[model samples]
Target: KAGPVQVLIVKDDHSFELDETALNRILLSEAVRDKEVVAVSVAGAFRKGKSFLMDFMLRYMYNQESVDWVGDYNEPLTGFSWRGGSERETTGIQIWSEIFLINKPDGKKVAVLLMDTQGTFDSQSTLRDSATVFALSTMISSIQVYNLSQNVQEDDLQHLQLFTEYGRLAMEETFLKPFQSLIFLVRDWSFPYEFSYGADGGAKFLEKRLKVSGNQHEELQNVRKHIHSCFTNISCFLLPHPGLKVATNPNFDGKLKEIDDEFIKNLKILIPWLLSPESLDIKEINGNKITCRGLVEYFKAYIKIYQGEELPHPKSMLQATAEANNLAAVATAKDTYNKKMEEICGGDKPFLAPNDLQTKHLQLKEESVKLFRGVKKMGGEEFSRRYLQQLESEIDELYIQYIKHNDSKTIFHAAR
Candidate 1:
């Protein structure tokens, strides 16, 4: 059954753990590793239905698939199923592995990855936790949904200000690029006024809030610019209350019948854009696409920055982490390339003929190109510059080896 998988659990002491089995499950999925990844993550206050909202999104995305439908009245919600109540449910960052497939009009299928984060402020939560969650979400997601109940408040903007500060650091350091769209999804909007700010209502609202000070504080001005400029697109969505009696009676069934029609209707509009090609352009680290395993590494690196309490000097930390990952990926790529090349070329013995050496060289050149391309695809530009030079050198060495064999008249020299 396709559902959400708990991938990370952060402790009170700020130490986080990963679910290796779940991570491996995602890593091994051909769809996840091979297809274009559209990542969506939701974050908000505790018990405010962050995960509940994610469940509906999953339902909408996996419409045709025969998976465990959470919205069905017949299906009972249990375990870490994003239950709505007064208590904290999601302990840390959680990822859904059962990829939702989006078949494009061109017959290409993109894999959509859904992520659920621990609530922003609960008894067990800390400000650092919220920062970490927001940081990671912005780092990895193509679309980041900031769930808010009621109207957008000062606290909400303040949280965003802090989030953008971290985001600014990330941007400056090249740890993660800004999300394609930072959607401010306001739930249970209680304002009497209707939105007339056009398609970018949420972004307009946030912009107005940021402009309230009118470039008074240089720090605020810079942050406002960084946050605003970071996203290629910024949008806002308003959702009505599903009318579930949560305050007094929290034991409500997650049935399709109970949810507001308007909420579902809007979701139908949002899901497509969420999986669009624009959103599917997820950021890469070290020249490779961010995998479930890589997400864990990002979280660990983020934790160190958080623990260090050094926001300004984040570049050094980022460089160190990125360099380490680059080294590891380079090592793996070299090893794989060597093994594959050797397998195809029949090892270092002598060539039967000059034509054989030429044929092998051409075939090996294709393989080498693919090998380097694979590594480049994985790391993007973050694949170490030195390592890429090494790859080029290795290819050149092979070409030289072919030339030497071709020039040698004696088979004895060819064997040498």
Candidate 2:
């Protein structure tokens, strides 16, 4: 099976570094330097075969043979998408350069960038590093996959709770859309307990532990509320174990042959669901659509912002960034409107009569509004309103000048 290529990596020092040479090669070869990216990232504990899962996922997405189903499967899956050994294989966030295509409703296609983050719990991480990992994952991905090796345990849920708690509190202090849909992939399902809770029972099961425990403090309760509200949609997938652990198996290729059909079947079904347009949303940061390269840059900036003796409050910084970006979007939209008007008018000088330019002005107004389309949803309504109002004023001034110029010309002609 064809393996994916690595584009970026985060080091142990919490610094984001780009493999620019490799990245440029892949992007240029694939002709996707200008394509819009739909990012997906997986975060969880180390040595849980997270990388292995992603490797198979890539193969599945491409409609290739599952490693388990193929004979002589000794293809040594080691490239940008590396699996774990006795120790942690992935040290930091690693992005793949191999892009996948998603056909839109109108038959247009967009690129998908898949990323795998360092396992949260392992010899490789401390609490602070884990928090950074979680924070970056949420910030960068539209669809964030949380890997659970076993059943949804309390500790596992609490780990997520801590991130969400911090996330919600950050939102209160500063406003930004820091939340995304969480897919709890419960792997190695060996529990005998049946889910009698109907279709949505899986989602409900995972969300049940989000409540504050008995006699817990009010702060925890508030955090719980914020966490619950953060994730718009929660999904759960229960997949049986593949019968062999990737970390423990000495004969990695042999282990592939032992993977049962049930695991393969469930995984096949899960992949398409994960890639469905509904499951993935467009991730925006600071009022701009985030691209693969943009994510690397943002992660670096975020790490720099958080580098200190004590963790800074993320709310203020994120909100400030969003406000700045929103204003920038407004400026960009206004400039675009001016250019369009200039093109329509056939020159920089709007010497045409007001009535002559009315239709063009109206069209320019519509285009300007479209520029602020998603910015409104990012809680930049005030900024959008202010900038668009300024654009309107400019348009009115142009029309007034047009009327005056035409009237003056009429008088000049009469005198002649």
Candidate 3:
């Protein structure tokens, strides 16, 4: 049997094929000259800097806006993710809203959207809570699990093991799978000596926890076994919050500044690839966001959290909704097009009406085949299997594109 770290890595592809130099240039293009969307999801046990992260995001995205705090709709392209953990149970309200927008090179625009989800179930009662179960069942597309505590020392390795194991299993079974994930260990950091473990010393805080000890600590042993067995390859980043920075005590700010830069740099590196336009399977180019001109369809879907509040509803979103007409017209149009194509050219070669003809003929042959076959074949298990596979691929692509397109749009304003 495979070991834990290797097992997780095997489930996903670690190799990223982008030319680092070229991709870096593309990323920097937005960084230097354009405003890109920076959609952020803040999750973890309550008060692990979830709100503080939001504050950082707000300041990062809206340095020029002159707002003291994040209001309803300040930065157009920066999307926000809600607090995910136990807080939703104690209170009925959603933790945070997801919204996004950005201005870019040329006439390009983008929108940032956040999805603030329910907090984790740190306790048993919290786990079985209905609201959390519903949210987990329905609302998640991606997740950024946070663990911000000074308490994760050597003695707490067992705790970390338990956390990661539960997190991995929950994630695998949840709506957000192989497609989206980020685990951040946000430690309430001490200065370089104690927390860092120095060049010679190992983690001072965690040495005790890693030790196998006296008594029946089977739960701890089980957690350790699970981490070693189930999750080894996962990438978990550390973020040390060096407390608030004061002018009188500037070191705090300096430490946090370094951490912030590293954090943003990693985000820029990883997130864009996850949200690249190429990843989405959409064919049409919908209208742009009011603030940024990144692909609208993907951005709209990616920032589901923001749709509830934050930025005003885009004119295009409204127009799209009207055009969709509760998705009736869209379905009708597809049916109509299918019938017309089969009527004119037979099932083998269905044609598009006028504008989309070229793209349809080239990229939609498989779809054409299915459409011509009608509901019977499309509904069959084999057909459904193929269609769902295609659909899932496309959906995954759209999700990635939406977030990144929005991120790129907000980069100018969102970068700290």
Candidate 4:
């Protein structure tokens, strides 16, 4: 079994660094390069069982052992280590090494990633560390599970509002809701009797928390508005406590039997529901779904923004998003051309007639152009036209190479 890879490391001295090699290893693997990414990550205060929760997502998505079985009751869970004690088990963003690939009805495949952000408000975490980690995971994942404990409180809302303020301030000047779905997962709910259970009850609890009917302060009111503006699709899910053994046991290896029946029942339903291809939103920016290869750019691009002191220059963040999207569009369009050419003139395929090759190349070029035009790209026409021309120029050269190789193959076949 492949272990989780920590792409970004947050150390004890409060220093944070990106593991570029590891990032590329996981994100740029053969399985992910061409597929869209649906990263379901969990982030909240440390030791709230974010890693524990993520392990179950791994179980449901990867360990599809049975229709009702989350996993073997006696079988110990095997994924991201559930941070048991106060000591930091995972000090950075942990991405599950194995890629979960899904098939969409539109014939496109998706690479589902399960990620866990380092817990904040623990040890020596500067707000910079918290903001950086939170923003990074929040942006990377398509469906972000905001894991909270006991009940949602003022500080929880404020912390969330604070972290999201980075996103809001970073692009408030230039974008329509700079994020995707955010589900507030309230764990170990003490008030299930009042708010009930599962998503139905969770929704009412979230509605109550987010509702701004009373004469609240303008500052606080804006907090809700900012969160609302940041995540266009906001939701909640309430989960019962996973029994005592699963929670308190340090030796717990994620045996399904160790957890509460209620927790399992709710979790069983929620995992499949959340991970449903219909329910999962492809990671998007500027209304365009990002492929896994495209997401690599976003990870690097956002890290650059995070590295530059802070959100001191918000416009740069906006520019970064556009720059990432512009490049993402180019790569997506570029792939269409390469994929098509590979079929027509790949190493395994035989050479075609000169006229036949030219006809196919022209049609392929136009098909790629149509795809590029149809895809959503930011920065308007100049970037679009420039990249389109760039793609055309590259494709033109590719034809020259293919035709030359075809001539050699044709001559060799005739001699034989």
TM-score of 1: 0.62
Query: Would you list the C-alpha lDDT of every candidate in the order shown?
Result: 0.63, 0.62, 0.35, 0.79
Candidate 2 least-lDDT 10 residues: 64-73
Misplaced by over 4 Å in model 4 are 168-173, 310-416
Model 1: per-residue Cα lDDT over 1-416, one tens digit each: 76567776787687666666776677556555666566788887777777777776666565534433334654544323765457788877888767666766667666677888888778776566777677777777767888888777766766776765675564425544445667777777654255532235555655665563653787656655666766766677666666655323456656555556665555555555555444455545544666545555565565555556466432333465666666665566556555654554443544456666557666655665566556533336654666667766776675665466445543554553
What lDDT is obtained when candidate 4 is compared to the true structure? 0.79
Q: For candidate 1, which ten residues in a row score worst on lDDT?
A: 191-200
Residues 100-219, candidate 2: write the lDDT tens digits: 766655454666777788787676555656766676677667778888876777567667876655434323243544666678887776752664221244566655656567787876
Q: Positional deviation of 189 in candidate 1, in angstroms?
A: 1.1
Global lDDT of model 1: 0.63
A best-first ranking of the candidates according to their TM-score comes to: 4, 1, 2, 3
Q: Which is the better candidate, 1 or 3, if ranked by TM-score?
A: 1
TM-score of each: 0.62, 0.61, 0.32, 0.71
Worst 10 residues of 4 by lDDT: 312-321
Question: Model 4, 1-416: lDDT tens per residue?
Answer: 67788888876676667898887888888878878888888898888888877777877776555685477789877678764777756667988888888776677688988888888777667777877788888878888989888788877887887787775544424466788889998888877779988998999989988877569887778778778878878888998988888778878777787788999899987887688767778998777889888888878877777776656532333455666776777777777877888898888889788889899999988988788777775666665777778878888888898888777768334553
Model 3 residue runs over 4 Å out of place are 1-40, 61-98, 101-112, 117-127, 130-143, 153-179, 194-233, 236-416
- TM-score: which is higher, 3 or 4? 4
The pairs that clash in candidate 1 are 286-379, 287-378, 287-379, 287-380, 288-378, 288-379, 288-380
Segments in model 2 whose C-alpha atoms lie over 4 Å from true places: 1-30, 64-85, 106-108, 164-176, 196-201, 211-223, 244-248, 254-256, 286-297, 307-310, 313-416
